């Protein structure tokens, strides 16, 4: 029926968060490099080209 | 001397290819380096962002 309150009186321990030193997060990976599939499309045209096309 | 045009425009096959490969070296080493400066930029945000971390300690400390 009764409620204990001495944790009330001090800082009631694992309630919501608790802190110590963390550090050096480092946020996040990056979202893949910059693609090149365009230039790799045009370069194998290009390499297809001087190879059969220009006899 | 259709030989010697023949081994003009042979030469301009060479030079609009290694100049095609040199393009895409060229374009692809910048691109290294900018990735390595990317990842230097992200090591950065850390440390500071540690820093960060270490002033709260401190702060909040000081409110409890």
């Known amino acids: 029926m009764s409620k204990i309150e001495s944790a009330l009186q001090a800082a009631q321990p694992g309630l919501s968060r608790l802190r110590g030193g963390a550090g050096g997060m480092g946020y996040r990976a990056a979202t893949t490099q910059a693609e090149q599939p365009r230039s790799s499309l045009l370069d194998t045209i290009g390499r297809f080209a001087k190879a059969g096309a220009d006899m | ?64």
């Open chain 2, 1 to 64: 001397g259709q030989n010697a045009q023949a081994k003009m425009i042979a030469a301009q096959t060479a030079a609009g290819r290694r100049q095609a490969m040199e393009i895409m070296r060229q374009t692809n080493i910048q691109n290294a380096d900018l990735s390595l400066q990317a990842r230097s930029k992200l090591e950065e945000a850390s440390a500071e962002l540690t820093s960060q971390n270490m002033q709260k300690v401190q702060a909040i400390g000081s409110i409890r």
